[PDB]
Write a protein that holds these residues in place. Structure first.
Motif, PDB file in Angstrom:
ATOM      1  N   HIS A   2     -16.440 -38.565  17.461  1.00 31.96           N
ATOM      2  CA  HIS A   2     -15.465 -39.553  17.014  1.00 31.96           C
ATOM      3  C   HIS A   2     -15.445 -40.697  18.021  1.00 31.96           C
ATOM      4  O   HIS A   2     -15.799 -40.521  19.192  1.00 31.96           O
ATOM      5  CB  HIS A   2     -14.041 -38.949  16.956  1.00 31.96           C
ATOM      6  N   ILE A   3     -15.011 -41.870  17.563  1.00 31.49           N
ATOM      7  CA  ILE A   3     -14.704 -42.992  18.435  1.00 31.49           C
ATOM      8  C   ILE A   3     -13.191 -43.026  18.568  1.00 31.49           C
ATOM      9  O   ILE A   3     -12.485 -42.994  17.555  1.00 31.49           O
ATOM     10  CB  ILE A   3     -15.199 -44.320  17.833  1.00 31.49           C
ATOM     11  N   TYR A   4     -12.677 -43.107  19.798  1.00 29.08           N
ATOM     12  CA  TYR A   4     -11.233 -43.270  19.991  1.00 29.08           C
ATOM     13  C   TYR A   4     -10.939 -44.680  20.478  1.00 29.08           C
ATOM     14  O   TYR A   4     -11.569 -45.147  21.424  1.00 29.08           O
ATOM     15  CB  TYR A   4     -10.703 -42.278  21.013  1.00 29.08           C
ATOM     16  N   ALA A   5      -9.979 -45.345  19.839  1.00 34.19           N
ATOM     17  CA  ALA A   5      -9.538 -46.688  20.237  1.00 34.19           C
ATOM     18  C   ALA A   5      -8.166 -46.515  20.864  1.00 34.19           C
ATOM     19  O   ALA A   5      -7.242 -46.035  20.208  1.00 34.19           O
ATOM     20  CB  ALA A   5      -9.444 -47.632  19.036  1.00 34.19           C
ATOM     21  N   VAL A   6      -8.044 -46.932  22.116  1.00 29.43           N
ATOM     22  CA  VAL A   6      -6.906 -46.588  22.975  1.00 29.43           C
ATOM     23  C   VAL A   6      -6.098 -47.845  23.275  1.00 29.43           C
ATOM     24  O   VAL A   6      -6.636 -48.791  23.862  1.00 29.43           O
ATOM     25  CB  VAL A   6      -7.414 -45.958  24.268  1.00 29.43           C
ATOM     26  N   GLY A   7      -4.810 -47.847  22.898  1.00 28.05           N
ATOM     27  CA  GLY A   7      -3.886 -48.914  23.310  1.00 28.05           C
ATOM     28  C   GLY A   7      -4.312 -50.293  22.851  1.00 28.05           C
ATOM     29  O   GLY A   7      -4.803 -50.495  21.729  1.00 28.05           O
ATOM     30  N   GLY A   8      -4.114 -51.259  23.726  1.00 27.01           N
ATOM     31  CA  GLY A   8      -4.349 -52.645  23.370  1.00 27.01           C
ATOM     32  C   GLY A   8      -3.047 -53.389  23.100  1.00 27.01           C
ATOM     33  O   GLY A   8      -1.937 -52.868  23.246  1.00 27.01           O
ATOM     34  N   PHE A   9      -3.203 -54.659  22.719  1.00 27.82           N
ATOM     35  CA  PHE A   9      -2.087 -55.538  22.397  1.00 27.82           C
ATOM     36  C   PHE A   9      -2.293 -56.019  20.969  1.00 27.82           C
ATOM     37  O   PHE A   9      -3.411 -56.407  20.599  1.00 27.82           O
ATOM     38  CB  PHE A   9      -2.072 -56.709  23.381  1.00 27.82           C
ATOM     39  N   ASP A  10      -1.228 -55.980  20.164  1.00 25.08           N
ATOM     40  CA  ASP A  10      -1.394 -56.322  18.766  1.00 25.08           C
ATOM     41  C   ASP A  10      -0.865 -57.701  18.445  1.00 25.08           C
ATOM     42  O   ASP A  10      -0.781 -58.050  17.259  1.00 25.08           O
ATOM     43  CB  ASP A  10      -0.752 -55.292  17.839  1.00 25.08           C
ATOM     44  N   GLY A  11      -0.478 -58.473  19.468  1.00 23.83           N
ATOM     45  CA  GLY A  11       0.108 -59.793  19.287  1.00 23.83           C
ATOM     46  C   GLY A  11       1.596 -59.841  19.563  1.00 23.83           C
ATOM     47  O   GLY A  11       2.156 -60.935  19.761  1.00 23.83           O
ATOM     48  N   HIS A  12       2.236 -58.679  19.577  1.00 20.23           N
ATOM     49  CA  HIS A  12       3.688 -58.629  19.856  1.00 20.23           C
ATOM     50  C   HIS A  12       3.989 -57.433  20.752  1.00 20.23           C
ATOM     51  O   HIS A  12       4.842 -57.535  21.631  1.00 20.23           O
ATOM     52  CB  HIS A  12       4.467 -58.511  18.552  1.00 20.23           C
TER      53      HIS A  12
END
Length: 281
Positions: A2-12
């Protein structure tokens, strides 16, 4: 895998959510969330667990680390780094995790630290020559390559290589373009530098390093210009996730097949995520 995408900023919101991608089903779904919100997070896999380190939580630059165990869907605390680091590069080699550069809230770091599983403790190793945040890191043969980033003045095209056996740094041929917020993949003996920001435009170009010839060359560009991306190699394909195109915090994902030099769109993430970290497990 699997690829895991962790956190980040969504614009708000700085995100503590984490989602997993199954390449056969071409679908994303959330898994258990992390304890801390983190954008600009570094991510690596060590003995089947996902380590997440550094980042920014909306108020403070973080030195904290956490580890995810996919089998139990549970997050556990790990010892803190020596410094807070956002925009940090991460490498795993020799059973060690290296955290490279980053921004501590005031300055861009040339320091590099290593995580010792003997002790669950971090310690500084030899520093790089150049300070770099938004840096891409790749392990190739036994060496750690550090590419691009931002030093507070220059959007860097320079590249350095670390030899852990000798705790020394060496210079590598510069990339074709300065790239801050660059994504990096290693597949089939080449390093790919993906996207980034060069000071004037977000980039959709991608370039590949041939270590035989110490030479960078462009390959086919992505569709969307992107910095702050996550990049993963899975089943021979390079996946580019999220990022920022100068206007939008992106949830888009693209896949590249080195055998056809072709990018293809795949299913979007559940959320836009810039400054997202990526793991493959």
């Amino acid at each position: 895998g699997h690829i895991y995408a962790v956190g980040g900023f969504d614009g708000h919101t700085h995100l503590n959510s984490v989602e997993a991608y199954d390449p056969e089903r071409d679908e994303w779904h959330l898994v258990a969330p992390m304890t801390t919100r983190r954008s600009g997070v570094g991510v690596a896999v060590l003995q089947g667990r996902i380590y997440v380190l550094g980042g920014y939580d909306g108020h403070t630059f973080l030195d904290s680390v956490e580890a995810y165990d996919p089998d139990t869907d549970t997050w556990s605390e790990v010892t803190r780094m020596t410094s807070g680091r956002s925009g940090v590069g991460v490498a795993v080699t020799d059973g060690h995790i290296y955290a490279v550069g980053g921004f501590d809230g005031h300055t861009h770091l040339n320091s590099v630290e290593a995580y010792d599983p003997e002790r669950d403790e971090w310690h500084l190793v030899a520093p790089m020559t150049t300070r770099r945040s938004g840096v891409g890191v790749a392990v190739l043969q036994g060496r750690i390559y550090v590419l691009g980033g931002y030093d507070g003045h220059t959007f860097l095209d320079s590249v350095e290589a670390y030899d852990p056996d000798t705790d020394t740094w060496s210079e590598v041929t510069r990339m074709t373009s300065g790239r801050s917020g660059v994504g990096v993949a290693v597949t089939d003996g080449h390093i790919y530098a993906v996207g980034g920001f060069d000071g004037h435009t977000h980039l959709n170009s991608v370039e590949a390093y041939d270590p035989e010839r110490d030479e960078w060359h462009l390959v086919a560009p992505m569709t969307t210009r992107r910095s702050g991306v996550g990049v993963a190699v899975l089943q021979g394909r390079i996946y580019v996730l999220g990022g920022y195109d100068g206007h939008t915090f992106l949830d888009s994902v693209e896949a590249y097949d080195p055998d056809t030099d072709t990018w293809s769109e795949v299913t979007r993430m559940t959320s836009g995520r810039s400054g997202v970290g990526v793991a493959v497990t």
